[PDB]
Each structure stands twice: as structure tokens, then as C-alpha cells.
């Protein structure tokens, strides 16, 4: 069995997204595919099953019109059209493999979830795609680093000395700002004898904006 798919693109509130995990190595007419989201710091919520043959899907008591499903027997991959995305929708999406067949609301108690693999990430934020305008940060043994801001979404990769230094390069966690920006901090440690003599640079790359900047760090003047 296999469930390799592509990562879902980040959607602002009031939009539509589609995610689909590929099915191969078997016949897609006997196992009903499920869907579930892994909310951070808590449990999971479920909306219904999708039989790959006929129109017998149902809905839970919490998801009436927010979720819609669509089957496709030519590709043998299930499709879904999410609507009314809110802050409670921010979770990674996993398609749950199931064994057996179940159409009635009482046959699934002998069913158990078979396989989990390679889920996509869905994060709901008003922000969509913006290009960064990151400016150098002055330093304070001694420590120095460059902080990234006014960019979306997470994450970004901070490389020092064109990737020739990897010791001490730690990506500090970010936080959801009021304006919707993030802040990934990476720092390195240098001796205090060399602070304004040796040129130090850090590289931050942005995937959707295609902006790669080589910003040199300098002390505050």
C-alpha cells in the first residue's frame, strides 16, 4: 500500500482547497477511504467515509456543508472541495486507510484503520503569498544572527557561509503575530576577538516568492 501525495497549498479564509492521496497497487473498488485532521495539541475530528463505487457517503453532526467529496474511478483517486475555512481548520490532513467494506452506519465496528502515510499540511491564515524585505540585524564569547520577518508561510532555511557551517545552526520557533508575520531565528557563535573584522553572511530562501537574499550582518552604527 502507498499514500504518497503532494503538500497542500496554504489557503486564506474564504477560499477552496483540494487534497488527494494516490491509490495504487490494488483495486480501488472495495476499500472505503477516510479523511481526518490532526489538530496540534489535541485530538482529531472525523466527517464521514467515501465508498469508491456509488453515492452513499454521509456527514457528521459538526460538518454539514463545510466538507464536500467527489470520487474519480478513472484515476482511482478521491477528490474533495473544502469550503468555509476558519481558524479551527488549521491542521495537517491525513487520509485514513480502512479494511473491509461498510455502507450502513453499524458495520464499521469490526473495521480498523489500516495505514497512515505522508499527509499534507493545511494552515488557515489571511496571509497568502508575500515577498520578504528582510533587513540585517545587528549583533550583541559573542553571538550573532539574522532574523527573518514579513514573510509567509513557514518555514525558511537559514544557511551561513554558503552552507559551509552547520554547527550551532538552530531554527528557533516562530509565533503568530498580530499582523500575521513570522520570526525564525538562527544564531551562530564566534569568538569575541573577531566581531567587525571578518565578513559574516547568512542566506534565507523563500519558496513561493522565489527570493534568495545574501544579507551581510553589521553592528549598529
Amino acid at each position: 500500500v502507498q499514500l504518497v501525495q503532494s503538500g497542500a497549498e496554504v489557503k486564506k479564509p474564504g477560499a477552496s482547497v483540494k487534497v488527494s492521496c494516490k491509490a495504487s497497487g490494488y483495486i480501488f473498488s472495495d476499500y472505503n477511504i477516510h479523511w481526518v485532521r490532526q489538530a496540534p495539541g489535541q485530538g482529531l475530528e472525523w466527517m464521514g467515509w467515501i465508498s469508491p463505487d456509488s453515492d452513499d457517503t454521509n456527514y457528521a453532526q459538526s460538518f454539514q456543508g463545510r466538507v464536500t467529496m467527489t470520487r474519480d474511478t478513472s484515476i482511482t483517486t478521491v477528490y474533495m472541495e473544502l469550503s468555509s475555512l476558519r481558524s479551527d481548520d488549521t491542521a495537517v490532513y491525513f487520509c485514513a486507510r480502512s479494511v473491509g467494506y461498510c455502507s450502513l452506519n453499524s458495520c464499521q465496528r469490526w473495521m480498523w484503520f489500516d495505514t497512515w502515510g505522508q499527509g499534507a499540511l493545511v494552515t488557515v491564515s489571511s496571509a497568502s503569498t508575500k515577498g520578504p524585505s528582510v533587513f540585517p540585524l545587528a549583533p550583541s564569547t559573542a553571538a550573532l544572527g539574522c532574523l527573518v520577518k514579513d514573510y509567509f508561510p513557514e518555514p525558511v532555511t537559514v544557511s551561513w557561509n554558503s552552507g559551509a557551517l552547520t554547527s550551532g545552526v538552530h531554527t528557533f520557533p516562530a509565533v503568530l503575530q498580530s499582523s500575521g508575520l513570522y520570526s525564525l531565528s538562527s544564531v551562530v557563535t564566534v569568538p569575541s576577538s573577531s566581531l567587525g573584522t571578518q565578513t559574516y553572511i547568512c542566506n534565507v530562501n523563500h519558496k513561493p516568492s522565489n527570493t534568495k537574499v545574501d544579507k551581510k550582518v553589521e553592528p549598529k552604527s
Partner: protein
């Protein structure tokens, strides 16, 4: 009805531990209880189904049982290199949907504290020429985590959007955290001394810089 689980499991290695998942009369007992476990940063995997048979791919190491309202998952000791979160799942006829537990993460049980190191980075002139100013200070070289960072202008603390990021575990057996603060150049140059304090549950150090160099 909402299924409940402990936030974390306290289990020492070398001796058996177990977890419980209390439910309701229409949720546990009349229906089977399934246990799921996920790797950190990876996909979940079922552990026990139908309460007495086990899937192929796991040795004779785990045990699960159901008794009335609550179900117990007996674990033969704990491996320090293999720690995963545990899930509890069932079905309710009135809810007509699968319900999942809160999630129990097993934790080992004592190491002495270390000496934290704190640094503070003033903004550069390129940040100030754009009519903005941000202040960031970082804490590292401390074990364990759960630290709180607050700003101080050496006369009274300022609250202009102060946040505290959650600590993250690195690979070199060391915890790290950071705090951010964005201001205006008028308020930034009003005070000639800025610092932030860390709380190591008994240790507190100050990193004082100046807005000159």
C-alpha cells in the same frame, strides 16, 4: 460526550506502566477500543484492534484490554530511545462519528540543572532607516525547558506586544527559546538601557546592552 485522556504519561523505564481511556456506556464496552501511536513528525500507526488480537509487524511486547467504562493498555516497561504519543479511539451511536482521545505522551523519570546563557541583539541601522525597530533576545545552553522571558527597561517593564515562544528540543541535548518585541523608533530611543530576564526555575540572569553599537 467528549472523550478524555491525560495530557502526558509518567512512566519510568525498567518496569511496567499503563494508560487508561475512560468513556461512556454507549461508547466503551458495547464497541471495541482501538489504540493508535504516532512518531514525532511522522504518520500514526494502529497498535491494538478488537482488544485481543494484534497486527503483524509488532512483537509480543504490548497488551491491551477493556473493562467497562475504561480501557487499559499495559506496556512492558519503557524504552528510552522509543517514546511516542498514544491515542484512544471509539464510536458513539448518538454522535454518529469516530471520536479520538486527547493524546497521552509517555515521559521518562531526573537530571541536574545547567547554567543558561543569554544574549540580546539590538536592531541595526538598516532596520531603523525604515521607520521601525525590533528587539530580540535569546536563551540557550539550559536544561530543561519551560522558561519565561520578559523585557525590562531598568525602570519598569514594558508590555507592547510581549510574547513567549514555546521551548523546542534540539539534537545536542539542549533546550532553547526566544522572545521577540517590535517597537517604534521614538519609544526605542526613549530608553538608553534595555534588557530581558529569563526564569530557569531558580536561576535568573540579565543581559544588558546599549542602543549605541
Amino acid at each position: 460526550p467528549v472523550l478524555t485522556q491525560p495530557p502526558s504519561a509518567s512512566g519510568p523505564p525498567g518496569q511496567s506502566v499503563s494508560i487508561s481511556c475512560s468513556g461512556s456506556r454507549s461508547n466503551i464496552g458495547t464497541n471495541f477500543v482501538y489504540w493508535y501511536q504516532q512518531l514525532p513528525g511522522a504518520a500514526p500507526k494502529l497498535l491494538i484492534y478488537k482488544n485481543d488480537q494484534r497486527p503483524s509487524g509488532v512483537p509480543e511486547r504490548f497488551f491491551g484490554s477493556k473493562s467497562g467504562t475504561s480501557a487499559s493498555l499495559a506496556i512492558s516497561g519503557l524504552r528510552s530511545e522509543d517514546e511516542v504519543d498514544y491515542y484512544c479511539a471509539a464510536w458513539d451511536d448518538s454522535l454518529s462519528g469516530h471520536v479520538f482521545g486527547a493524546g497521552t505522551k509517555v515521559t521518562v523519570l531526573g537530571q541536574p540543572k545547567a547554567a543558561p546563557s543569554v544574549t540580546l541583539f539590538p536592531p541595526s541601522s538598516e532596520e531603523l532607516q525604515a521607520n521601525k525597530a525590533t528587539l530580540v533576545c535569546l536563551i540557550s545552553d539550559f536544561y530543561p525547558g519551560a522558561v519565561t522571558v520578559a523585557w525590562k527597561a531598568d525602570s519598569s517593564p514594558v508590555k507592547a506586544g510581549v510574547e513567549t515562544t514555546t521551548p523546542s528540543k534540539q539534537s545536542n541535548n539542549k533546550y532553547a527559546a526566544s522572545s521577540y518585541l517590535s517597537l517604534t523608533p521614538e519609544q526605542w530611543k526613549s530608553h538608553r538601557s534595555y534588557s530581558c530576564q529569563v526564569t530557569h526555575e531558580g536561576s535568573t540572569v540579565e543581559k544588558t546592552v546599549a542602543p549605541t553599537e
